[PDB]
Design a protein around this ligand. Structure first.
Ligand SMILES: NS(=O)(=O)c1cc(C(=O)NCCO)c(NC2CCCCC2)cc1Cl
Ligand SMILES: NS(=O)(=O)c1cc(C(=O)NCCO)c(NC2CCCCC2)cc1Cl
Ligand SMILES: [Zn+2]
Ligand SMILES: [Zn+2]
Lengths: 261, 261
């Protein structure tokens, strides 16, 4: 039911999904008044992100984004529990306005945003169970700007004509997921927040990398024109565009940075 | 009922106030890709703004803002219909993040924002009746930034002491409300939108002046710290801060400007 536009859009999510009206919501605007350096934010290490090219990973249109399932041997090292990968997906704008990141930086949107969702595998047996527990999830967010062609992102994008409708699935050969991350991953923003989509559970430890990556105008346009939120046979199709939430009030939180300056 | 935080905050307004999840919602980000000069946008004329110094006007803390009642002989001339004044009020942030305008410009908040609310007195008998009707309301918005002391805003701010708690009421002697407007009121942004508070009716013609006004650092801090949104004898007092709505999605639409330069 829920959407990003019209009667069932984000100002109405809380009618069905109470946590969407609760505290600790994401995304937010990352701006100077609410930033504070924290020297305890040491580098993350990305383990098992180089997925074998001889293996396949399932790509699905879930009616709200395109998501790639990830294996649980892929994990982050450096947080207080091991967080194992479960899926990645994206958020984007539209062909005439390619400004669809969720997080903003000093009030500006980026073209798009990648989220790599992980769950606390030390405590829970699956990501669905972790998603409604405190700090159950950890997301890596990469801000994407319009720039050079990016062959690594194209390993996902080149399959989109294949998952155009809700519920369709495709196989993507493995590739090195770390190639989707930017430069200087040691520099990031950290804060406690939520899923940015229903059910909006306040259970996410966010890491937003300081530096963006680039993908080209043509790759953005392919992303923004390939997909539909509706099933193949729906008589009222809806293009999957503008699938980002507006930024949320901070509710007195601060965002911690691993960089001073 | 409704608040700007906690579980009765803006993502939940649409539960009781369905138009808050509907079309034409305000405020919005005024950014360069959506601006279009319109030579039809000629200067407004502010008639009856020089309020009698021998009359007193009711200032209230309504638990959401500080509001000054205005008389219906005060009006805007230059729109299709005459719009007569009914009240003015303000929105602001807080001392740790003093960026509480409702509209943004190229993604940036100003420190605060004044709204002078008018209703279509040619079509309707009073503001209450107009507010949910076609062409019902027109708001003048002034963006406020910290700078010089402003004696004209002090004609309101010197009374904040007497309206500290919700429900409290004071009298302000008439003064020239045009003094609250910025330079070059010929230069403005114009679009059709909504109340930025419940009930969020889509019945407002917005005029946001291009140029901000200044108030001193001490005036801005007094506005941010003088008021409480709770009644005086509430045993859990809450300071009135951050009383602005987040910006709303605005797609496939333009904001018209009276200025091209
Ligand atoms: N955007 S986000 O905040 O990164 C986020 C999104 C989803 C999600 O798949 N949303 C459906 C619409 O695409 C999610 N889903 C959960 C479901 C339960 C299992 C773990 C993934 C977890 C997260 Cl953190
Ligand atoms: N912010 S705004 O969009 O300028 C706006 C706000 C209010 C208002 O007073 N909200 C209450 C909380 O302070 C309003 N109230 C109406 C009530 C019915 C009579 C006319 C004024 C009309 C408008 Cl346009
Ligand atoms: Zn996401
Ligand atoms: Zn207002």
């Amino acid at each position: 039911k829920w959407t990003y536009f019209g009667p069932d859009g984000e100002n109405s999510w809380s009618k069905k999904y109470p946590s969407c009206g609760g505290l600790l919501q994401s995304p937010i605007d990352l701006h100077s008044d609410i930033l504070q350096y924290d020297a305890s934010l040491t580098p993350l290490e990305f383990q098992g992100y180089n997925l074998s090219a001889n293996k396949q990973f399932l790509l699905t249109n879930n009616g709200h984004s395109v998501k790639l399932n990830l294996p649980s041997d892929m994990h982050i090292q450096g947080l207080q529990s091991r967080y194992s990968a479960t899926q990645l997906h994206l958020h984007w704008g539209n062909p005439n306005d390619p400004h669809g990141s969720e997080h903003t930086v000093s009030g500006q949107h980026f073209a798009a945003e990648l989220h790599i969702v992980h769950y606390n595998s030390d405590l829970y047996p699956d990501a669905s169970t972790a998603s409604n527990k405190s700090e159950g999830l950890a997301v890596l967010a990469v801000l994407i700007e319009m720039g050079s062609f990016n062959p690594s992102y194209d390993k996902i994008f080149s399959h989109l004509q294949h998952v155009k409708y809700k519920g369709q699935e495709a196989f993507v050969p493995g590739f090195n997921i770390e190639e989707l991350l930017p430069e200087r991953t040691a520099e990031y923003y950290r804060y406690r927040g939520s899923l940015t989509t229903p059910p909006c559970n306040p259970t996410v430890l966010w890491t937003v990398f300081r530096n963006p990556v680039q993908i080209s105008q043509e790759q953005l346009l392919a992303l923004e024109t390939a997909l539909y939120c509706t099933h193949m046979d729906d008589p009222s199709p809806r293009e999957m565009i503008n699938n980002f939430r507006q930024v949320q009030k901070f509710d007195e939180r601060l965002v911690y940075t691993s960089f001073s300056q």
